[PDB]
Ligand binder design. Structure first.
Ligand SMILES: COc1ccc(C[C@@H]2C(=O)[C@@H](O)[C@H](O)C[C@]2(O)C(=O)O)cc1
Ligand SMILES: COc1ccc(C[C@@H]2C(=O)[C@@H](O)[C@H](O)C[C@]2(O)C(=O)O)cc1
Ligand SMILES: COc1ccc(C[C@@H]2C(=O)[C@@H](O)[C@H](O)C[C@]2(O)C(=O)O)cc1
Ligand SMILES: COc1ccc(C[C@@H]2C(=O)[C@@H](O)[C@H](O)C[C@]2(O)C(=O)O)cc1
Ligand SMILES: COc1ccc(C[C@@H]2C(=O)[C@@H](O)[C@H](O)C[C@]2(O)C(=O)O)cc1
Ligand SMILES: COc1ccc(C[C@@H]2C(=O)[C@@H](O)[C@H](O)C[C@]2(O)C(=O)O)cc1
Ligand SMILES: COc1ccc(C[C@@H]2C(=O)[C@@H](O)[C@H](O)C[C@]2(O)C(=O)O)cc1
Ligand SMILES: COc1ccc(C[C@@H]2C(=O)[C@@H](O)[C@H](O)C[C@]2(O)C(=O)O)cc1
Ligand SMILES: COc1ccc(C[C@@H]2C(=O)[C@@H](O)[C@H](O)C[C@]2(O)C(=O)O)cc1
Ligand SMILES: COc1ccc(C[C@@H]2C(=O)[C@@H](O)[C@H](O)C[C@]2(O)C(=O)O)cc1
Ligand SMILES: COc1ccc(C[C@@H]2C(=O)[C@@H](O)[C@H](O)C[C@]2(O)C(=O)O)cc1
Ligand SMILES: COc1ccc(C[C@@H]2C(=O)[C@@H](O)[C@H](O)C[C@]2(O)C(=O)O)cc1
Lengths: 142, 142, 142, 142, 142, 142, 142, 142, 142, 142, 142, 142
């Protein structure tokens, strides 16, 4: 199947806005372009969505559940806090790849826990924006 | 630079030996072949080593430290237990990508802790043997 | 008084959609019908609402607070995570019955904690969709 | 099948004896009468027993195991402490409904843990003596 | 009022039997005699009972609740484990003095917790058999 | 600069509605008026906003980040639960003053933890609605 | 000395009654016969007793203390909960061998703690009913 | 009433002495002057005292208890360690405002606990020396 | 020997000063008189001292160590916090009886821990000022 | 099948060398002789190996996995620390009996945890060198 | 620079007074003499002070801060309890060597924590009074 | 006796190799020379060994046990992880001095725990390479 859903959670629309010492440079719009391009090279179609609203994220997850489509999810802070997002993700029959740009293990202790990792197929963290592209390649070869 | 070190720790020589319901099929020799091939496609040279001996792993890490070469490390059970391996890895100036074949977050609680993740560049788990190939691609694009 | 509010939180609109091995069969629309029918047999009027949005749930709780109406609440994942929902529920002067379809004590440890149970009148879990009907009957006899 | 066992543990024979500010009013004998009456309205026969002796409770549970009869159990303080009672209850093939009169989540932290909840079909707490009658109705509709 | 109940729990009938290096010398019968004598000097009547059966202890506590009589309780190992005994003791309207012969704080960590201390009037530990006599004197002056 | 953002989170629109024994009397509209008046006396302009929606709060925080404006934040229950709100607040270059009306240390243990306090400039709790006015005065003198 | 006491606690009278997928097949009466036979082959006399009553178990332990006889004890659920049984067992001058049929380390975490193991001579778990026979052989060779 | 007691604990006499990168600049004598001036503008009299001696602090607290005078307390390290200071502060009938210059939540975990916060009226941290002046203003408006 | 040292720690000089709902009525001077009188009836001499200064308490303990005199100690808040006081008390060769007026187990969890209880002969709590007199009687009979 | 592997880990070669108050008397060579003799009486062949090297232990475990041979394992300190040894042992299809000479529950708390017990068939501790012989007898009867 | 401050905390004046089985023999005066002599051999001047008063210790630390002089500190029980002493020690610009006579890791668990170790240059424990002399030698060679 | 064993564990052969900002400058060979020289000045002979292999370290410890020779041990990462090394060290009859170059209390929390400290004579940390020389001097004076 061509279709892969890339879903970004709270604050992910802020990439590139604060000082390019940090998660700066690549904007969310640029990230979408990079993803779409890589997906086309791989023979996939990426549908990339971002929201600061948990309810909106839940709706996108429900739609992927109903369509049996794979999901690459960076849930932002909700990674660490939301059982509701886990409940929705546990419905997915297709692969779920959890992605984080930063190395969530190199910061505060509360970031080393994810409600999603135990139900995800796999997890990529700390490899920057390329982590999304690597997830796409996993899905293309599976 | 061409050279990337792939270092596999205890029990990783056992891939493919127990019932192909599990981490079965791909042998360690096959894994080496897959890695070497992908590395050549990427314009890298992969040097793949496996040992059940922590001391041997430490020596390989020291050599990568001295040569300023990147390391893709799957330390096996020592991931969860060895401060000595962390101490050696903290010396590396080039990237360190932690890889696990299985999703270490979907099993016992003790597997969700890694001495290596806080000092690694990033971490890939649960994406099977392709996780090594994805790490290689990260290193090629950086 | 006739009026009882039944409020369902995130993911509760998904009942009946995934494989009828699981929380499958009864849809949310069917649940509403069952509740309305039981409420009429008991001489009550049930107002049944579901949302994936915490803000919407909070508004429904506020309205029940202002009207001094009882609430039967299945907050879904927010049961385990939301202090805001607890704060809103602590305002209710009429009874609050917490309901869960599944036995929240027979799963992961994080599901055995509820922010709501300490401020609820009582709690029913694991009795399936009938738990809502039993809550209704409690309220009718009180 | 007609037969449902209602089993009450330590101190449950004390209902109604201390000041009717508290769990006062309804005596254990009255509780038995209420249960028997509700059971007959539902087309069941309730066999209601109470003991302060764990060994006696265990024998009643064994008998329900051997007869494949459902059990409504309020184990009193043993809810929070007895692995032996859990071991005996895990043998039951018919439903086990855990009931508590008080809201065990609104008191000391040690009362929020039950050895029985993980192996019970479901749990009703905080709905007073009506919780037993609601358990009976669950069993009648299943 | 004259009457004070002294209630001893499991293993307390073993005083004086194992090597008089330890809680040896004074037998339970001797303890009863010492208590009765001190009580008469104080103008009280002590009713001293011992059982290895929690159910029997519960019955004695119930009787003290119903008679509004003070209780001096050394619950033995049940001090550290029984919520049922606490539930029964919380019914007592007259004073409850918890007594232990040994210093329960000078041994294993699990002995430093008592289900009874938070609901007792007070607690005497480590003063040997005289702790019972001191409890009696407290009750005589109050 | 004149402009200070006062942002109130879930349930803060409920001030003054439940029995004036409690956080009763001052309504949210009154709070806004008090804040605006104090801000004008101090030579500032306060922009006061309240929402029960985390996504809306995040947008207001983003806008303050982009405008480099100070924020006085009472995040309500999200204080204790939301990593996403912390992530957004960590972007602010201007001061962040955390305010709570109640003394969050005098209630349940879960209220003594704040995701925001470690990244805030400072914190005021328990001084009632005047805490907002005191935060304003801090910002005016800095 | 010939005499060894085998003492079985709550629920041990249930062996062989529930579906022979589980601890099924060997009944408690059969277990007694196997033990007696092995004891005679070893030149010992086994006295095998079972009770669901902690008080009865305590009396049997007291008798072994007074007679200076070894004890093979499978305390069932009381293994994990009873300080009183530990107190009684600490009196034994002869060896105490703790036995469990099941591997108590391969189940819930609460089963991995025993009040008895620290005061037992040794412990055998997970070797089925043969664990009793192996304990007997230990005692015969010592 | 005019009189407010400002009490500073151990090390607070060190303000301004170590390198003005840190809590440098304002000396304790300067702090006293700032406080006195602000108090006079508010129509109060501030009595400002500092000691490194817990016993001296206790005496000042006792005097405020006896005089029914409000206290603004920065107990320094004793904030985190002293139950005796809490015991003395619990006697105060007038308001107690806890103040810290630094943000105690932005440092080591042990600094996020205060024995005083649960019994204080409120708490101000991280707003520098102005926190004292803001406490004064709270007391003037109440 | 006649001499017994009664040592009272921080805040104990405050008895009787705050509202006689609480630890009110008996002043410290009255307590001294009661103790002296009881000691004379018992054929002892009580030397009663109180200080809010840990250093002063330590000196009194040292003197009791050097003189091999028994100590009845109510260390106030230092009970829960001071290792130094424990170190000094561990030197005492004569009995050490820990006394608290209030039931330290019926309040906050931090009050249920004492650095002194493990090294004391015994402990009396919750029996009011009579606890001192009962300690005196223990020492007279030993 | 005849063949049983007895594998001893670090420090087990030290038996009998330090003062025969302790694990003294029986040397490792003597242990091997005792095991071989018992195995022959049982109709088995025991292959007994000891190493201080985790890598060597892993190789012996791998060989038992490949040959489908039972293992009696005393991993010494690695019992408490090595996930790698657990990973290797989880491959074994034949029984795994964990043995310890000492009672690991009667010492430091860290010795009461074993990475091996949850995946072993059973566990024998505290029965001295006879524990190996008893394991052999288990395997002979199964 | 010649000058080194040796500061001893509570109870350190008790060295040599209790039975020379223990920290007996060397008195505090002897310790001072040994230190002074070693310091002169090393070309230093040691200023040795001891107090049971935390306030006095704080003053000595302040003076060392102001003079930029090194400190060898054995804070006695305050090692384990005092944040105030840590706050004062964090001001020191010259080296801080923490010394304990006893091995603080070989006793109760609470002694294995030090508020001082994280801010000290280094730590010497368990080497008796020579630990002070070794600290002096460290300072002489640096 | 002349002979002292200095044993260095994993990674200690790396001293001086990574950037002389850090544990840089002194190489392991230089460390050996410094130790040998100091030992000769003290009238001792130091035998200095380093290995990355736990098995090799264990053999060196065994040899020191058999020869009754003192050991100065810096076990590197195994300090924090190895029970096997502790088991071997507990055999030593001569002194064991634990040394670390860095201050293990000033880094991650896992470094503040040592399996060796409770069985060592004493411990020196944070005093750099001179810590070894100071250990040597301790042993020379004892
Ligand atoms: C202020 O905007 C952002 C955007 C992304 C992040 C990182 C992402 C999060 O939202 C974190 O809560 C999470 O721990 C890591 C993260 O998901 C990532 O690295 O992609 C943080 C702040
Ligand atoms: C029996 O051989 C193996 C080989 C690999 C594994 C998985 C790897 C480990 O060694 C585990 O300790 C680790 O938690 C996960 C692992 O590193 C992986 O999934 O690659 C387990 C057993
Ligand atoms: C994917 O849709 C659902 C719907 C309901 C549930 C169960 C409900 C929840 O949302 C859980 O988070 C909660 O622990 C139990 C639950 O509230 C219930 O059993 O009703 C789970 C997933
Ligand atoms: C003194 O008699 C009683 C009777 C019932 C209770 C409540 C029941 C218990 O025995 C408690 O231990 C349990 O936590 C709650 C309880 O099972 C109930 O509410 O039914 C308490 C004391
Ligand atoms: C074997 O007989 C006894 C008798 C009394 C005790 C001490 C009492 C107990 O039953 C302990 O569980 C409890 O911790 C202390 C005790 O209640 C006492 O010291 O009186 C112990 C064993
Ligand atoms: C039902 O409406 C409210 C409004 C405010 C509060 C207090 C605020 C919260 O939302 C709490 O979750 C928080 O712990 C304290 C609070 O932020 C405050 O005191 O301002 C509680 C319930
Ligand atoms: C329902 O009857 C039984 C009988 C034996 C057991 C196992 C035994 C127990 O009573 C458990 O509580 C214990 O953890 C293990 C057990 O003692 C054994 O395996 O022998 C469980 C249920
Ligand atoms: C070395 O002098 C000082 C002075 C003040 C402080 C900060 C204050 C303390 O004493 C800390 O223990 C406390 O955690 C914070 C503090 O009370 C404040 O920020 O006012 C620290 C060191
Ligand atoms: C404000 O004066 C006092 C006096 C005594 C107390 C009780 C005593 C303390 O100092 C407490 O810290 C301790 O927990 C209990 C106490 O030692 C007692 O009840 O005697 C409390 C406050
Ligand atoms: C110094 O040589 C030894 C040999 C055996 C032991 C006991 C074994 C260990 O290696 C311990 O780590 C383990 O906790 C217990 C042990 O496995 C046993 O009792 O057989 C200890 C030290
Ligand atoms: C009764 O006099 C003393 C003197 C020194 C000590 C040891 C020192 C202490 O004060 C302890 O609190 C600390 O844990 C260890 C100690 O600092 C040392 O060994 O020097 C103990 C009791
Ligand atoms: C990369 O080489 C090294 C060498 C020494 C260290 C410090 C030593 C260790 O191996 C640490 O695991 C330990 O916590 C501290 C250490 O033992 C020391 O400071 O000597 C660290 C890395």
């Amino acid at each position: 199947e061509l279709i892969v859903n890339v879903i970004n959670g709270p604050n992910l629309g802020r990439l590139g806005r604060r000082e390019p010492a940090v998660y700066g440079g690549t904007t969310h719009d640029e990230l979408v372009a990079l993803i779409e391009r890589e997906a086309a090279e791989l023979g996939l179609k990426a549908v990339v969505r971002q929201s600061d609203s948990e309810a909106q994220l839940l709706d996108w997850i429900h739609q992927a559940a109903d369509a049996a489509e794979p999901v690459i999810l960076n849930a932002g802070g909700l990674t660490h806090t939301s059982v509701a997002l886990r409940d929705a993700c546990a419905e997915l029959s297709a692969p779920l790849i959890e992605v984080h740009i930063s190395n969530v293990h190199a910061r505060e202790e509360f970031r080393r826990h994810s409600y999603l990792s135990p139900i995800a197929t796999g997890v990529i963290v700390g490899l920057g924006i390329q982590g999304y592209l690597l997830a796409l390649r996993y899905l293309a070869e599976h």
